[PDB]
């Protein structure tokens, strides 16, 4: 099975809401039993959380159950995945300068998926549209990503 992580800073707000998009996407795409959702944070601060109360609220009103319980990344996330995908472009660059030479191929930005919103990067949800905006990037991200998945080895 495909195992795919979703990265950010702390694990409590963008990348589990990531994680839960993406999860649903697979769903409705009935692709559940070929892939694996996880999350995780480059700093270890937060460890142990639930996510962001706010954002679990949000997610759930639209369909996303946002359950993920923060964890830091560790070595062997980048033996272990497929592929990682950073929230914003300071994780990218974080996450390359840990990654193993032999694994960096593996790390993509998430935001490189969207097709329909130009953003650079998925905000901080800091009032409580900041929460909506977030989802809606990862709608957009998520459905290209599980298309592009399907369709071979990502290369955008």
């Given at each position: 099975?495909?195992?795919?992580?979703?990265?950010?800073?702390?694990?409590?707000?963008?990348?589990?809401?990531?994680?839960?998009?993406?999860?649903?996407?697979?769903?409705?795409?009935?692709?559940?039993?070929?892939?694996?959702?996880?999350?995780?944070?480059?700093?270890?601060?937060?460890?142990?959380?639930?996510?962001?109360?706010?954002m679990?609220?949000?997610?759930?009103?639209?369909?996303?159950?946002?359950?993920?319980?923060?964890?830091?990344?560790?070595?062997?996330?980048?033996?272990?995945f497929?592929?990682?995908?950073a929230?914003?472009?300071?994780?990218?660059?974080?996450?390359?300068?840990?990654?193993?030479?032999?694994?960096?191929?593996?790390?993509?930005?998430?935001?490189?998926?969207?097709?329909?919103?130009?953003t650079?990067?998925?905000?901080?949800?800091?009032?409580?549209?900041?929460?909506?905006?977030?989802?809606?990037?990862?709608?957009?991200?998520?459905?290209?990503?599980?298309?592009k998945?399907?369709?071979?080895?990502?290369?955008?």
């Amino acid at each position: 099975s495909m195992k795919l992580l979703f990265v950010c800073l702390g694990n409590i707000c963008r990348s589990p809401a990531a994680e839960a998009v993406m999860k649903k996407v697979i769903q409705n795409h009935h692709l559940t039993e070929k892939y694996i959702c996880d999350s995780a944070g480059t700093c270890s601060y937060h460890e142990g959380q639930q996510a962001d109360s706010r954002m679990r609220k949000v997610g759930k009103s639209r369909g996303y159950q946002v359950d993920s319980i923060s964890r830091p990344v560790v070595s062997s996330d980048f033996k272990n995945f497929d592929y990682i995908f950073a929230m914003d472009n300071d994780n990218y660059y974080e996450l390359l300068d840990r990654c193993p030479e032999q694994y960096k191929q593996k790390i993509f930005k998430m935001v490189d998926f969207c097709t329909t919103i130009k953003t650079t990067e998925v905000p901080d949800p800091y009032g409580e549209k900041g929460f909506h905006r977030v989802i809606d990037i990862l709608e957009d991200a998520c459905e290209n990503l599980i298309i592009k998945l399907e369709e071979g080895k990502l290369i955008n």
